[PDB]
């Protein structure tokens, strides 16, 4: 009846398997091949692209998904290699139509994700990639013309920010140097139409942001143009030139035969993702410009300010730094090996793009110090030609100091002095003699003074006095000695003189807090008590930074007691400054320790910065360095408490009870931290508004000119608060608009708040 399977096998499946390949290893190898194509090779680029297209094609059956992944990534992460990868995709497309169609779908997909996650800067690379794929017979030009139509239509939405409209326009005009010719060849009537729309929009845009973002206000020798006005002139010059440009390298031109055989794909209609309350767009920009061909008469002719070559070159070099900024040797190497269709003065472009980055407003793309070490690496790499370009560039930045934005001037000062410290401080000071007979308050003599102060901080007083010509001695910094009020100046009649003597004797034999408190009771909130204590203590620790930190620590209890009140914190700072006014660096490090150990707080320091005692030094760099350092500590404190609260919640997913209570107490400390930060900004703005108003009202009443050196500095320091902390300050719109920067505010001051608003409007 019933029968088990016979020929008694269990089906004959393999009993064992030997591992003969590895998916990861293959995927890593593919990624390496894709990332490396275009690098130096014994074989030509074209040769390597055909080979690679062959290796990739043969791996499609098993790794297509991966290969697609890799090429999209290269598309958004390596824009400087654009035409290399579009060529590669073009080869794949010619061999495989489905792959191409599939790649294009993957690209539009990724584009939409980037846009939704507010990754607009990457999105532009993706868009440029789609554009160049038209040259590689992968995408039909009319479908590209059509997507750009929807882009420009963004200029049409109602109730959306200028920066949103702006981007879409930018991504479109941006692509034209790559695909301008093709799109205008196939659809010239319709391209003329979009240029009409686009143009009318540019004319309509507001330029409220421009003064906040220019590196120089002066129109000559080079205007610093708003980024879209400039790009539009470049495109318009490209159009007059029949869409011929002389720079971009296009490896696909060598595959004319293969690519003409292939079949194109159409892009689907594209709906720009609608603006939502959560969307964030790039800030507008002003094009940094300092060179023209006359600056390099011996070199190949420099492309003009209004050529698409200048735009592409600079774009690619910024992208090179973005890819390699963490590794300076590699970064320098990539910059110097940047290729092009025709010869260009590469050393001028590199130097110009680096300064474009360091001087960018609101902020450089990367930490300021990187630019210094990068330019040093480039000087070692190109020792025969790059240093002369950098010296020349320096002489040019100097000569144009007069309308340079304060924020940039600070960076120029910090860069130049740090650079010089790497080269024995060698510089031709007499070239800058013009500055010796100008008002000491004007930008040039001010810059020279601040530079020499910085150089002294990287060495020492006598060194600096020794390297400048005798005629610059007036601009040299003071000997950083401390001033002891109760020293050997026969002034026994000063109040607390004898208490100061007791204090000194007690410190020198090693005092305790209780002992110091005891002596201080003999003083007539007690300002005089603070004065004698601080004067004597700082004086006895004057030898070095760590002697001083040591004193602040040892007698921390006395500081915290004497400065419990707000007037106490203020008086400590005031007396500290009377002691160490000749030594700004010591002032900075002491203010830092006092805040970190709560002898004083951020509000006290803000008030102190704007106090009458600091008035003579108010336009000096060290003052603004201290203020910003104080703000940075407030900001970092808030972040730290936020981070701790986020991890307590994340960890919540007796042990429970204890954690919930800790969360509650953390939430309570965040609100307190955030309120302290808001106050600090509020105080800073209130003081700026009050002292700017005093100036403007006095000048207009008295019939004198508003625009003085003092004013240039004060208005731009206010500007500078907004530039460095805009993300934080945007949290305070309602308060600022209602209570500080109101409609009645003198327009000179209001304008700065408006310029700030114009960054994300």
């Amino acid at each position: 009846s019933r029968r088990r399977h016979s020929d008694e096998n269990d089906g004959g499946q393999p009993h064992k398997r030997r591992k003969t390949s590895d998916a990861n290893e293959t995927e890593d190898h593919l990624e390496s091949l894709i990332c490396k194509v275009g690098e130096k090779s014994a074989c030509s680029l074209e040769s390597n692209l055909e080979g690679l297209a062959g290796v990739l094609e043969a791996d499609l059956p098993n790794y297509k998904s991966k290969i697609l992944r890799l090429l999209c990534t290269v598309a958004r992460l390596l824009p400087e290699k654009l035409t290399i990868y579009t060529t590669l995709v073009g080869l794949l497309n010619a061999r495989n139509y489905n792959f191409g169609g599939e790649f294009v779908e993957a690209m539009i997909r990724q584009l939409k994700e980037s846009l939704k996650a507010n990754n607009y800067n990457e999105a532009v690379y993706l868009v440029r990639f789609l554009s160049d794929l038209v040259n590689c017979h992968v995408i039909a030009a009319p479908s590209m013309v059509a997507m750009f139509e929807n882009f420009v239509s963004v200029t049409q939405e109602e109730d959306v920010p200028q920066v949103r409209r702006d981007w879409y326009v930018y991504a479109f005009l941006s692509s034209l140097p790559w695909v301008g010719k093709e799109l205008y060849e196939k659809k010239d009537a319709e391209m003329d139409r979009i240029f009409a729309n686009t143009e009318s929009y540019l004319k309509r845009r507001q330029k409220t942001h421009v003064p906040m973002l220019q590196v120089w206000t002066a129109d000559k020798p080079h205007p610093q143009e708003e980024y879209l006005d400039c790009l539009w002139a470049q495109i318009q010059k490209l159009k007059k030139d029949r869409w011929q440009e002389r720079h971009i390298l296009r490896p696909y031109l060598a595959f004319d035969s293969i690519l003409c055989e292939a079949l194109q794909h159409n892009l689907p209609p594209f709906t720009p993702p609608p603006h939502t309350e959560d969307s964030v767009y790039p800030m507008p920009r002003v094009i940094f410009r300092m060179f023209d061909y006359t600056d390099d008469p011996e070199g190949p002719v420099m492309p003009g300010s209004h050529s698409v070559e200048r735009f592409v070159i600079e774009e690619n070099l910024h992208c090179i730094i973005k890819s390699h900024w963490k590794e300076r040797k590699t970064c320098a190497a990539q910059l110097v090996s940047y290729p092009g269709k025709n010869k260009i003065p590469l050393n001028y472009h590199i130097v110009e793009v680096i300064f474009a980055e360091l001087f960018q407003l609101p902020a450089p793309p990367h930490i300021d110090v990187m630019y210094t070490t990068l330019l040093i690496e480039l000087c070692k790499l190109q020792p025969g030609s790059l240093p002369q370009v950098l010296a020349q560039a320096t002489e040019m930045l100097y000569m144009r100091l007069d309308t340079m934005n304060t924020t940039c001037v600070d960076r120029f000062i910090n860069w130049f002095s740090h650079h010089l410290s790497n080269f024995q401080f060698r510089w031709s000071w007499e070239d800058w003699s013009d500055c010796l007979s100008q008002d000491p308050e004007s930008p040039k003599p001010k810059f020279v003074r601040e530079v020499l102060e910085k150089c002294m901080r990287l060495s020492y007083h006598q060194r600096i006095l020794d390297i400048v010509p005798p005629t610059f001695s007036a601009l040299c910094p003071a000997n950083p000695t401390c001033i002891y009020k109760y020293g050997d100046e026969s002034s026994n009649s000063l109040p607390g003189h004898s208490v100061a003597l007791c204090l000194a004797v007690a410190f020198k034999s090693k005092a305790t807090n209780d002992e110091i408190f005891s002596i201080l009771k003999d003083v007539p909130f007690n300002p005089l008590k603070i004065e004698v204590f601080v004067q004597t203590l700082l004086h006895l620790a004057a030898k070095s930074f760590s002697h001083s930190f040591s004193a602040l620590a040892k007698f921390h209890e006395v500081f915290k007691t004497l400065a419990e009140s707000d007037e106490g914190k203020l008086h400590v700072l005031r007396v500290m400054f009377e002691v160490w006014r000749n030594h700004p660096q010591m002032i900075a490090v002491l203010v830092d320790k006092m805040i970190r150990t709560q002898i004083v707080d951020c509000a006290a320091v803000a008030n102190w910065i704007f106090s009458s005692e600091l008035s003579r030094d108010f336009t000096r760099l060290f003052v603004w360095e201290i203020l910003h350092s104080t703000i940075r500590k407030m900001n970092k404190h808030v972040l730290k408490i936020q981070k701790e609260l986020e991890e307590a919640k994340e960890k919540l997913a007796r042990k429970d009870g204890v954690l919930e209570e800790q969360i509650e107490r953390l939430q309570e400390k965040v609100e307190s931290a955030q309120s302290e930060q808001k106050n600090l900004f509020l105080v800073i703005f209130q003081r700026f508004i009050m002292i700017l108003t005093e100036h403007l009202v006095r000048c207009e009443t008295d019939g004198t000119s508003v625009l003085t050196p003092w004013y240039k500095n004060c208005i731009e320091r206010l500007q500078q608060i907004f530039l460095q902390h805009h993300q934080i300050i945007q949290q305070y719109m309602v308060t600022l608009e209602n209570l500080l920067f109101t409609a009645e505010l003198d327009p000179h001051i209001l304008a700065v708040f408006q310029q700030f608003c114009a960054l994300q409007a």
Partner: protein
Amino acid sequence: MNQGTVNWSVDDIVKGINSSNVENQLQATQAARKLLSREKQPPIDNIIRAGLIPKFVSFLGRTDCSPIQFESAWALTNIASGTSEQTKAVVDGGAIPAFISLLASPHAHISEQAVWALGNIAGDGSVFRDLVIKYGAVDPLLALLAVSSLACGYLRNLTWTLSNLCRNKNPAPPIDAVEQILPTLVRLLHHDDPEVLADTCWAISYLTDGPNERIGMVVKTGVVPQLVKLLGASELPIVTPALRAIGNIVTGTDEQTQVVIDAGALAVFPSLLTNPKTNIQKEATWTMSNITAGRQDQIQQVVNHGLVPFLVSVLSKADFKTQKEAVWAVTNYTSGGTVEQIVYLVHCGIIEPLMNLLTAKDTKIILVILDAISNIFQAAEKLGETEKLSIMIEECGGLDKIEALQNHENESVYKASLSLIEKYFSVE
């Protein structure tokens, strides 16, 4: 010099493995792995003879050095992928306890590799299977499969290794191990990957290949309807094992066979009986032959689903190996069937294709057919249609074939054919 780690001599591997510098070791280990995964004639014995296993086993534990765990895991996988002596060497190296430890690695590529190795080791047979289970391989393995979405490779590797813990007999896997494995198999049976499904079916087909207790643990799980659904899958790799499982299940009790009928098996059969893949035809008709050994009400469901004309076609037109199964199906049917059921079978044209196989060179099959004939004559007696059946058999040449069996070499065939001649073909 060598080029990187391609094609080192054993001697180089030995010197690099026996070095103080782990980077030397990591390169030698990789060199061994490349030798072991090469297309042609991996030198397994040479590597074993060079005393490398223990070192390889050490490396599995070098927690700190992620890369060398992987290269060694991959090496030992390829050694154990060979013959019984080669896998026993890996096992004697203490590799089992150490691969299980790796199942918990934070690096997915390493645990995945430990899964593959344990799979090769269990795949050797019942002893190493048991040996693997007893080291506690099961808990962690199943631990990896809780709450997709892992990578494909990874899932397939896990499923394949589980299917080896389910496989082989004498003895069958420990019952308790099976009961803990099964719930995972049930969920894997509902996954979407073709290869995971193929191997989950194999796994189940292994568990159902045993006595009524074993069959009943699979049945009680509720998987049969899903097995029956996979019989219709367009992928042959999945149909085959699903069909084998369903086939093993109906070798069980009538109640267990009822479960597969209840799940829709009979509606797929017409498709499997005419499947151009003859292995499928053969297995399906085998399966049917065990269904028709069931109760009269089950035979009736075979009838009501129109399966008989299909059995007659297979009896007539299929290759011999499939015809043998159909002979069994027909004879079981005639053995348990009611009179009306036999009548219908005769009406479907059973006699001729049945008598045609009396020339078979297979004496066992000849005895089964004569049994069927005897069964059908017993139905004929109750109906008084004995003569009509005789003439039916006579008219298609069936009597000539039964008489020829009088001179058959086999004594049983002679006795059974004589008995038929005597009772029904000797009119006075």
